[PDB]
Amino acid sequence: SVQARNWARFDKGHRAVYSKKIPQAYNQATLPTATALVNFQVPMPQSMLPTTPSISGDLGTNFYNCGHSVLKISNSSGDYLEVLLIKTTGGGYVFTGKILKTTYATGNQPTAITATAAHYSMKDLKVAGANGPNMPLETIRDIDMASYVTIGVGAGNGGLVLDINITWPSTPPTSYWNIELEAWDMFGNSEASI
Amino acid sequence: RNIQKLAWVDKQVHSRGSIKVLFQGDSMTAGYDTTSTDRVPANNGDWATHASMTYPQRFMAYLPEQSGCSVTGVYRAISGHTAIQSYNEPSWQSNPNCDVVILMLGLNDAGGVAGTTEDIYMEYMEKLIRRFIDWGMGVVVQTCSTGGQGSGGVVANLWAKRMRMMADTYGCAHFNADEVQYYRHNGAVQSDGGHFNSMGYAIHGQMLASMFMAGGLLPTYRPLTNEINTWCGRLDDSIGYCDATGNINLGRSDGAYTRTKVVGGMLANVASIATFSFYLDAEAAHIFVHGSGAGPINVLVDAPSWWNNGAQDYYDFANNQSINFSNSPQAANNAIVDLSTTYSADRKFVGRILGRGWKTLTFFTNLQGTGGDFYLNSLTVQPVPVGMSVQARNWARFDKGHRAVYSKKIPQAYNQATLPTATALVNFQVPMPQSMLPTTPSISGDLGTNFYNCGHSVLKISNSSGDYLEVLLIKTTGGGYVFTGKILKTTYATGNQPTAITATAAHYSMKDLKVAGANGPNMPLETIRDIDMASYVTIGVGAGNGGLVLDINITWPSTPPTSYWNIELEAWDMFGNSEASI
Amino acid sequence: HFNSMGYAIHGQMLASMFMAGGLLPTYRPLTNEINTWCGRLDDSIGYCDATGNINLGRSDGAYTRTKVVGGMLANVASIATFSFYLDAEAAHIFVHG
Amino acid sequence: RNIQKLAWVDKQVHSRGSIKVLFQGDSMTAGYDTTSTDRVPANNGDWATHASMTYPQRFMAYLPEQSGCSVTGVYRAISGHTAIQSYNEPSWQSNPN
């Protein structure tokens, strides 16, 4: 149990891991083509959120009000990439991704890994009255996984996400990627909560 | 009398019997729909146009399908009717000769229809309950099922809650009808502000039948709160098992992958339906199965999977969803059991069920009788956080899970009265983690060839000498079941680093702790079996029913170092997952 | 015997049982995570609109799929209370507000 | 009758109604406090000094605040009293309504 987040005490939590496979391994009747990992959106973890932004300030300026998350990337080629997503600069909502451990050579290591805090936009699955008079009665809405807006640029009600941008020195390697975002979280926390 | 009749009805539901059901209520019971074009002309004694499927109609088509209990219904529902009107209806003064009455009134009573007050509503609902009991019918009282997910019918539902508590005096079973659309899209299930469409009424009837099969009629029923491993024929106060077709083989065999040895089986070339019904007391639950067989096994978990006339496109969006939009896209029903003979002994991740309410898990083979066999050895329903719920493994979405760690000490530190000797770590067997399993091997291929169908696990090894070894266990080659162990971080020197670390996927063999009749005639009655931790067979070489394991082989360049090792296998897993499930 | 604070605690817990629906025989203590909103009716969490001005209106501006925006209007004193029996030693409280 | 009245009371609690509450019991119900200085002189038909806030007093100040249901209470609590004494109390033989 956490009394106050990022308070004067050590908050005992677990290691919440956000796992995704690029390309997906579910129901692939044929072998998917190897893809380049240059951009993906992972939900913003709890440790990265500001504590009392109205009082202690937001991550835009007070870049200490956030914590860190570890981005562990591995591919079917055996290449591993451990990235420390931490905010070193203010003035924006960009987390500096420092590579901790990588099996890539220095000329093959990604040049810059950027984690940008953002909110998903909301989209209408079925606008009210789309099928006819009062069908549906109300608009059926969903989060737009393709539309996300950087914090400060605009407001989105789809949830806090990280726009992870991986910049490669040469053409991006293509493989079957395993993406894990490791960060501290409250035990069994469903959503990162400010 | 009401309790005895409800007990008889429950036994009929769980014994493939027959029940005559009285559907008494207002427009919501009648299936009122005057807004959409998915209507049928006024029937069943009502004046108002009805949706193409009403809740009683779906109940009568659904309960026999999922439980085998034949259901015949009598309609006593008129749109706009109140408790006072229902009690004094000239055509409803006769006994309909039913077994159970499902009574839902109060939406019109709260509106003051027929001069109805709260006291009048209470008195006449009590009178209706007494009259129904006097007619030999068990009474199931419903709260006012309305639209808006709590935004409407507030007074009606307050009166309904008071009526439900009053009906507790008469031992009446209850169905919280107001929460049947709580985790759904309102637009997908409503025709107007307070009335459902065909799909909404279908959902209501299906949840009512789910309460019937779950044992919710019984006063000893308890909603499912924690992970449960249930099998065919298991009797619990939380999960109600129904053999709808009456042909599920509750035979005991050592070929089962469970310790209960119940092999509950759907024979080939016959249509078998096994359904598990329960109230999920959580926002989500992961569904796991220990099942094997050759012919297609079909699992239906949520509403649009059982009935959908396709009258509206949006009827498909009427499955249970997460309440919050944040990082939770529209949920589609995905309940698949992968019948790969490679992983037949292994647990299969069926999918997730969303929402708090009455759930039915329908396991059925080919309904036309042209399919093969399936053995439903055990079913696991594990309530999970809704953000941790996985719809489909390794799908187009980011699945939020935790970091499951398999920890072992070589040598063990437990009950070591003397200091154990330092041992060399060259070979150990760790259970195969979830991230390393193939996704839909029957469709997307197994790890033997499609070496992408697996994920990676990190093997973190540390010893009492301070030497650390972080190994990425990942499959880089096909043609076998060998995972290439790439050393990520090690405190060893380059000449001291292990030359090759190999993780081989394998199954434990099963061994007999006590063969049947070992101690004498019929002692023990049955063979007591266990997994053989010393005997494991590589996948493809042979079949083992002891569980998916990794045969970790560490090759050292020189004589293997001897120390006190701490072995941790880090990998992604579903929150609280007990077993890696394909 | 309690002091003033102990008796205050006892009375407050008694009122909590009253508002939670603990008088009802169908009440169940809260055992797992629940996402409840204003106006939601559960056998575990009892919602009370103390001031009677919590807006149970439906709007797409809500951050939940239930669209209940249960709202405390500006310049008016609004009190929304949720009462339940916590069947655990601790619980994390989260709000979408 | 008890179940019907409890249902009515629950609806009043959850509907901003009004309930008249009888607080019957021993020193713990009366709010006995003869040890601390946080006391008030013996009131509510009891002989013993009471704490500055008793459980019934906090209940009557708390339930209307958190649920909107007005609460008026009748005190039938005397310190040191038992069930036999409470049943045969000369002043408690009348209906407190």
Q: Which residue has the tokens 């409890």?
A: D6
Q: Provide CB contacts within 8 A for B87, sequence distance 6+.
A: B124, B127, B128, B131
Contacts of B579 (CB under 8 A, 6+ apart): B288, B346, B347, B547
DSSP state of A44: P
Q: Is D13 helix (H, G, I), strand (E, B) or coil?
A: helix
State whether C92 and A186 contact (CB < 8 Å): yes
Angstrom distance (rounded) from CA B93 to CA D57: 52
Please name the residue that has the structure tokens 């109600």: B240
Asked if C touches B (at least 3 Cβ pairs < 8 angstroms), the answer reads yes
Tell me the CB-side half-sphere exposure of residue B160, using CA atoms within 13 A: 30
With CB atoms and an 8 Å threshold, state whether A1 touches C63: no
Angle of helix B198-214 versus helix B55-67 axis, rounded to 10? 40
Tell me if B157 sits within 8 A of B146, measured CB to CB: yes
For residues B276-288, one letter each, b for 16 or more C-beta atoms within 10 angstroms of the residue's C-beta and e for the rest, the string is bbbbbbbbbbbbb
CA separation for the pair A56, A7 (Å, rounded): 12
Beta carbons of C60 and A186 less than 8 Å apart: no
What Å distances lie between residue A162 and A75, A151, B211, B339, CA to CA? 20, 10, 42, 37
* Non-local CB neighbours of B415 within 8 Å, separated by 6+ positions: none
Closest approach of chain D CAs to the CA of B44, in angstroms? 34
| A53 and chain B in contact, CB less than 8 A | no
Does the distance separating the beta carbons of B161 and D3 come in below 8 Å?
Answer: no
User: Token pair of D33, please?
Assistant: 């406090």
Rg (CA), chain C: 15
Q: Is B126 on the interface with D (CB under 8 A)?
A: no
Task: Report DSSP state, residue A84.
Answer: E
Would you say B379 and B276 are in contact if contact means Cβ atoms under 8 Å apart? yes
B76 and A CB contact within 8 Å: no
Q: Chains meeting B at 3+ CB pairs closer than 8 A?
A: A, C, D
Question: What residues of chain D lie within 8 A of the CB of C47, using their CB?
Answer: 14
Q: Which residue of B has its CA nearest to A138?
A: B187
Other C-beta atoms lying within 10 Å of the C-beta of residue A42: 23
Contact B165 D8 (CB under 8 A): no
Dihedral-angle region of residue A176 (phi above 0 means left; psi in -120 to 50 means alpha; beta otherwise)? beta
Q: Note whether B123 and B103 are within 8 A (CB).
A: no
B557-567 as b/e: b if 16+ CB within 10 A: eeeebebbbbb
Minimal C-alpha gap between B2 and chain C (Å): 18
DSSP state for residue A187 in the 8-state scheme: T
B86 φψ region: left (φ > 0), alpha (ψ -120 to 50), beta (else):
alpha
Q: Nearest CB to C50: which of D52, D56, D66?
A: D66
CA B289 to chain centre: 9
- Hey, what are A20's tokens? 């995704």
- Inform me whether the C-beta atom of residue C39 falls under 8 Å from chain B C-beta atoms: yes
Please name the helix (run of DSSP H) or strand (run of DSSP E) that holds residue B442, with its range, or none: helix B441-444
Experiment type: cryo-EM
What region, left, alpha or beta, does residue B67 occupy, with left being phi > 0 and alpha being psi -120 to 50 degrees? alpha
Of C58, C60, C92, the CB nearest to A2: C92
Backbone Cα Rg of chain B: 28
Helix locations, chain C, DSSP H: 4-20
Bond before A23 cis per omega within 30 degrees? yes
Question: 3-state class of B140 per DSSP?
Answer: strand
CB B275 within 8 A of CB B67: yes
| Interface mutation vs chain A, best among C60, C63, C69, most A CBs within 10 Å | C60
Cβ within 8 Å, pair B150-C41:
yes
D and A touch with 3+ CB pairs <8 Å, answer no
Type of residue at B370: T
Q: Which residues of B18-56 are buried (b: 16+ CB within 10 A; e: fewer)?
A: ebbbbbbbbbbbbbbbebbebbbebebebebbbbbbbbb
Query: Are B126 and B103 contacting, i.e. CB atoms less than 8 angstroms apart?
Result: no
For the record, the structure tokens of A40 come out as 């993906």
- Measured between beta carbons, which residues in chain A are less than 8 angstroms from residue B312? 131, 135-136
CA Rg value for chain A: 19
**Residue D16, C-beta contacts closer than 8 angstroms, at least 6 positions apart:** C49, C50, C52, D67, D68, D69
Resolution in Å equals: 2.4
Which of B422, B367, A99, D36 lies closest to C5, judged by CA?
D36
Say if strands B138-142 and B173-175 run parallel, antiparallel, or are unpaired: parallel
Residue with tokens 């249902």, as numbered in its chain: D7
For residue A108, the 8-state DSSP code is: T
Q: Which residue on chain B is closest to A190 by alpha carbon?
A: B387
B321 CB within 8 Å of a chain C CB: yes
Q: How far apart are CA C32 and CA B382, in angstroms?
A: 12
| CA-to-CA separations, A17 to B456, D58, D78, in angstroms, rounded | 13, 46, 59
Is C2 in CB contact (< 8 Å) with chain A?
no
Q: Please report which helix (H) or strand (E) contains residue B211, including its range.
A: helix B198-214
* Dihedral sign, Cα of residue B18, residue B19, residue B23, residue B29: negative
Encoding tokens for residue B4?
A: 């005895």
Q: What is the H or E stretch that residue A148 is in?
A: strand A140-150
Residues 6+ apart with CB under 8 A from B183: B283, B320, B321, B322, B323, B354, B355, B356, B357, C65
Q: CA of D7: how far to CAs of A31, A145, B165, C22, D10, in Å?
A: 62, 47, 7, 11, 5
Q: Chain C within 8 Å of B151 (Cβ-Cβ)?
A: yes
Residue pair B35/B48 in contact by the 8 Å Cβ criterion: no
Separation of alpha carbons D69 and D58, rounded Å: 14
In sequence order, what are the residues at sequence separation of 6 or more whose Cβ sits closer than 8 angstroms to the Cβ of residue B414? none
Q: How many CB atoms lie within 10 A of CB B538?
A: 15
Task: Please give, rounded to a whole number of angstroms, the shortest distance from the CA of B252 to a CA of chain C.
Answer: 35
Helices marked H in A9-137 — which ranges?
A: 53-56
B503 vs B431: CA distance, rounded Å? 11
Residue B572 contacts residue A15 (beta carbons within 8 Å): no
Taking CB atoms and an 8 Å limit, are C32 and B282 in contact across chains?
yes
Helix (H) or strand (E) holding B19: strand B18-25
Q: Which chains touch D (3 or more CB pairs under 8 A)?
A: B, C
Residue count of chain C: 97
